[PDB]
Amino acid sequence: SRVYEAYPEKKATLYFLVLGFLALIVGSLFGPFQALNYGNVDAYPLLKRLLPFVQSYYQGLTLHGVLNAIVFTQLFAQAIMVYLPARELNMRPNMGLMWLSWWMAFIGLVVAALPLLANEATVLYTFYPPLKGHWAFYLGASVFVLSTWVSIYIVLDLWRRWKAANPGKVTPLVTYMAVVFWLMWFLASLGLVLEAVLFLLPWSFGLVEGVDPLVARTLFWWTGHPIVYFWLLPAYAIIYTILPKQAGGKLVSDPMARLAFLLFLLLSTPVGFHHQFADPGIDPTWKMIHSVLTLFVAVPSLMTAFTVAASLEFAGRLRGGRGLFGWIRALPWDNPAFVAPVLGLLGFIPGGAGGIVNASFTLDYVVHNTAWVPGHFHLQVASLVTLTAMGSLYWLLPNLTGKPISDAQRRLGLAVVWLWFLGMMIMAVGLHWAGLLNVPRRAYIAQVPDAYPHAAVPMVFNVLAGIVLLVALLLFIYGLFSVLLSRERKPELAEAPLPFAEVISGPEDRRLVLAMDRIGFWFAVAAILVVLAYGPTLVQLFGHLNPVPGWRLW
Amino acid sequence: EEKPKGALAVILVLTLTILVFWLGVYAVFFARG
Amino acid sequence: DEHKAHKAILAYEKGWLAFSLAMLFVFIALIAYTLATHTAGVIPAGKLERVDPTTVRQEGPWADPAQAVVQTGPNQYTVYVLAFAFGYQPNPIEVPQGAEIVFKITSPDVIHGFHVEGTNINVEVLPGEVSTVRYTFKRPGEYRIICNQYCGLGHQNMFGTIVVKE
Ligand code: HAS
Ligand code: HEM
Numbered sequence: 016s017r018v019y020e021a022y023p024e025k026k027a028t029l030y031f032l033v034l035g036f037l038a039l040i041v042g043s044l045f046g047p048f049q050a051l052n053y054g055n056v057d058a059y060p061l062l063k064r065l066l067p068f069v070q071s072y073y074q075g076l077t078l079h080g081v082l083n084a085i086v087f088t089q090l091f092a093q094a095i096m097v098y099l100p101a102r103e104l105n106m107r108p109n110m111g112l113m114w115l116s117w118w119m120a121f122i123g124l125v126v127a128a129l130p131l132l133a134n135e136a137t138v139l140y141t142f143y144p145p146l147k148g149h150w151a152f153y154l155g156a157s158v159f160v161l162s163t164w165v166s167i168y169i170v171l172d173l174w175r176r177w178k179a180a181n182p183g184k185v186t187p188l189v190t191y192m193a194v195v196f197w198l199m200w201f202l203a204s205l206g207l208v209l210e211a212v213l214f215l216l217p218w219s220f221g222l223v224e225g226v227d228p229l230v231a232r233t234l235f236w237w238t239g240h241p242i243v244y245f246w247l248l249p250a251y252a253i254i255y256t257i258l259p260k261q262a263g264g265k266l267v268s269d270p271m272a273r274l275a276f277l278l279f280l281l282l283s284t285p286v287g288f289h290h291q292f293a294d295p296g297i298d299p300t301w302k303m304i305h306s307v308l309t310l311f312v313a314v315p316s317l318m319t320a321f322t323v324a325a326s327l328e329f330a331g332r333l334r335g336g337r338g339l340f341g342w343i344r345a346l347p348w349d350n351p352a353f354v355a356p357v358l359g360l361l362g363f364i365p366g367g368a369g370g371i372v373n374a375s376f377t378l379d380y381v382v383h384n385t386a387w388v389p390g391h392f393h394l395q396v397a398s399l400v401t402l403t404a405m406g407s408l409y410w411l412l413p414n415l416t417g418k419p420i421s422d423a424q425r426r427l428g429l430a431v432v433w434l435w436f437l438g439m440m441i442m443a444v445g446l447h448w449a450g451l452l453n454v455p456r457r458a459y460i461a462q463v464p465d466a467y468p469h470a471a472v473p474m475v476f477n478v479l480a481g482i483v484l485l486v487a488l489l490l491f492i493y494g495l496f497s498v499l500l501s502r503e504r505k506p507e508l509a510e511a512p513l514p515f516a517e518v519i520s521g522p523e524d525r526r527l528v529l530a531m532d533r534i535g536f537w538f539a540v541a542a543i544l545v546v547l548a549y550g551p552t553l554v555q556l557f558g559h560l561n562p563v564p565g566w567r568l569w
Numbered sequence: 570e571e572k573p574k575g576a577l578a579v580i581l582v583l584t585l586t587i588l589v590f591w592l593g594v595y596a597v598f599f600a601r602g
Numbered sequence: 603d604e605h606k607a608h609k610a611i612l613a614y615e616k617g618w619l620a621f622s623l624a625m626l627f628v629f630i631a632l633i634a635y636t637l638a639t640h641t642a643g644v645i646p647a648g649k650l651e652r653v654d655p656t657t658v659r660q661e662g663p664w665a666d667p668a669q670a671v672v673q674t675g676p677n678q679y680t681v682y683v684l685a686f687a688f689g690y691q692p693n694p695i696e697v698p699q700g701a702e703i704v705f706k707i708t709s710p711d712v713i714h715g716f717h718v719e720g721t722n723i724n725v726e727v728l729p730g731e732v733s734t735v736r737y738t739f740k741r742p743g744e745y746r747i748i749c750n751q752y753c754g755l756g757h758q759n760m761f762g763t764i765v766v767k768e
């Protein structure tokens with residue numbers, strides 16, 4: 016291959032995506048079996064016959080968790096927030112480093128997947144101590160997350176190098192999103208790394224016989240909340256800078272897109288205590304502070320709601336948008352690249368309301384650790400983030416390989432996307448319903464059939480969802496592999512440009528946008544927000560450490 | 570052209586969604602309080 | 603057109619944001635109110651109370667389950683609860699109405715959940731830490747405790763009991 020020699024960035028991107036979607040498939044198969052579990056049907060003896068290695072429901076849950084929420088998304092971000100800024104700047108990433116970051120993800124993945132497959136790490140994706148997994152679960156996951164640190168370096172390098180060539184000019188939109196993304200992410204990952212270097216890693220090698228559970232989960236949710244925004248913003252980058260092109264219109268305001276991403280650099284990390292509303296040893300006033308800051312982090316998403324909506328109305332009207340709702344029928348509902356994220360954005364609407372509920376401190380106690388929590392983030396990570404990812408196959412995958420899309424394939428995906436969406440909406444009502452009826456999550460509830468009899472009617476939805484989504488998932492696997500198995504190649508659409516969306520600009524832009532490009536300053540603001548929100552609390556925990564020995568309960 | 574009437578429609582749906590959820594959850598808390 | 607549209611949108615966007623904030627400040631208001639009323643009790647105690655998880659049921663308040671309940675004021679009763687791998691001590695917990703029960707909960711093994719169905723009592727239990735919550739049940743009858751944090755193969759099965767008297 017020639018394409019691969021002057022743009023070797025295309026090949027490296029695909030190896031990130033393939034490994035990312037493969038981890039989606041292997042991780043997702045446990046979903047339907049879990050959806051029925053909450054419909055009070057026990058599907059697992061069937062699964063034990065299919066997959067002999069699966070030992071328990073919770074080893075299935077750890078795999079579902081880690082391979083989707085941790086491996087799939089992190090390999091999607093690494094694919095998008097490196098390649099996209101590289102395609103706008105038309106510059107090559109330091110290649111030696113890009114492959115060193117891919118192999119790290121792959122060596123890091125293999126080394127950690129064995130202890131999971133060998134049931135030596137039935138601990139779930141949050142791996143709260145004192146539940147001690149095998150040492151190779153921790154070492155492997157370390158190398159897996161530390162991979163993003165080389166990606167950060169690469170995008171910051173691309174940025175440094177662009178600045179060098181155009182002195183005094185404003186950072187281009189996509190790069191700006193990419194740059195404030197990986198900076199935020201670096202601030203975020205510090206809580207995980209410190210948990211890893213201080214406790215988890217020495218623990219599983221035996222160096223230390225104990226770990227404090229309170230510092231271990233305080234540092235976790237340091238990284239534990241921004242990493243959900245490390246999932247989202249890759250889809251947000253694609254909805255801002257690519258969707259308005261796919262809908263037949265423009266992005267209505269560039270400075271609004273920059274301000275949305277700026278607030279996410281500010282209010283991303285210092286909100287962890289919303290996850291620890293029901294934990295001991297944390298001053299109630301510290302939480303009321305982190306409750307308010309989380310409501311503030313709702314603002315970035317509230318702005319996006321209007322900025323995109325006006326862009327879609329702008330698109331629909333240009334295609335011939337009629338009265339108040341006439342623009343809706345005028346969109347290109349024939350293109351899976353358009354249908355996928357929009358639907359997700361609809362389902363995102365109940366998703367955010369559920370979210371703002373959980374942030375309200377005292378109201379958390381109502382829903383905490385019930386089925387409601389999964390009902391919330393499935394409308395978030397499993398709907399909008401994954402649907403965007405699925406749709407994005409229909410443009411990005413042509414641009415990487417040079418293989419085109421047939422009319423059979425274009426239609427097959429539309430169904431997949433309509434089902435997946437229709438399957439996630441049915442489930443949502445199911446878990447929100449049962450969560451308000453006290454059904455705990457993280458539990459093999461089918462194996463205790465007489466425990467939740469008042470949840471008769473939502474259990475119907477859960478059963479229904481698992482069937483529809485199993486169908487949706489299979490069709491996807493089928494549709495994907497056909498694209499990746501054809502010997503059809505046009506090396507010219509492998510060289511066609513990415514369909515970025517053009518931006519409406521005004522006079523009031525200049526002075527604003529110019530202020531937000533003061534990156535080094537805002538990064539320092541973001542860091543002092545962390546020291547102010549976490550430093551006081553962490554210091555008090557560090558003086559009074561209380562390690563407890565390791566346990567294995569699977 | 571004119572007023573983003575349709576966008577105002579979408580954010581309002583979102584305003585009602587947050588209110589039915591939040592105020593709804595504010596009910597069960599006191600009824601469990 | 604286009605330049606007419608850019609201006610019109612950033613106009614309705616300044617308002618939208620002013621509305622969202624004011625609506626958020628209402629949300630900040632109503633939370634503040636619930637922190638002022640009786641209902642604010644279920645929020646865990648702020649102060650660190652360290653314990654050894656390996657001595658817990660040999661020496662100290664949690665050792666004898668016949669000793670878990672202890673009246674400590676006029677209308678006050680302290681219940682020392684113990685959430686272990688797949689079970690709760692004491693089983694059952696017996697308590698009176700109109701009385702303000704102050705739970706003090708801990709684990710000898712792993713992190714367990716403590717969720718009392720039909721109440722706001724929803725607190726995590728961490729080995730090496732006492733979790734202190736307050737509640738005055740107004741309703742009488744049969745209370746069922748549920749473990750809502752993965753704690754082992756028999757997690758789905760770890761139910762507890764609070765027994766409240768008329
Ligand atoms: C990627 C997935 C993530 C999304 C985004 C998400 C949302 C929120 N969350 Fe969350 N979350 C919490 C805070 C929030 C807030 C404030 C929102 C915000 O990030 C989102 C606000 C959303 C909005 C304000 C809506 C914007 C809507 C838009 C932008 C769409 C408009 C539609 C259009 C334009 C369509 C037009 C189309 C046409 C056709 C017209 C809290 C506490 O405050 C808990 C704890 C619960 C508990 O106790 O366990 C929690 C639970 C979770 C868990 C479970 C963790 C566990 O295993 O322990 C995960 C993984 C997760 C992540 C995610 N979460 N969350
Ligand atoms: C194949 C379609 C899917 C279905 C039917 C499904 C269903 C479920 C259900 C019912 C649960 C609750 C199980 C329990 O708490 O015991 C769950 C857990 C979870 N799901 Fe999914 N899911 C699907 C795909 C996904 C995807 C694509 C993601 C991420 C992109 C995801 C992320 C998660 C996470 C993070 C958990 C909780 C992990 C933990 O607490 O250990 N799921 N899923």
Ligand code: CUA
Nearest residue numbers: 714749753757
């Ligand atoms: Cu104790 Cu789950």
Ligand SMILES: [Cu+2]
Nearest residue numbers: 239240243289
């Ligand atoms: Cu969060």
Ligand SMILES: [Xe]
Nearest residue numbers: 127155156159
């Ligand atoms: Xe991993």
Ligand SMILES: [Xe]
Nearest residue numbers: 157160208211
């Ligand atoms: Xe790490």
Ligand SMILES: [Xe]
Nearest residue numbers: 153156157211
């Ligand atoms: Xe880790």
Ligand SMILES: [Xe]
Nearest residue numbers: 239240242243
């Ligand atoms: Xe997480």
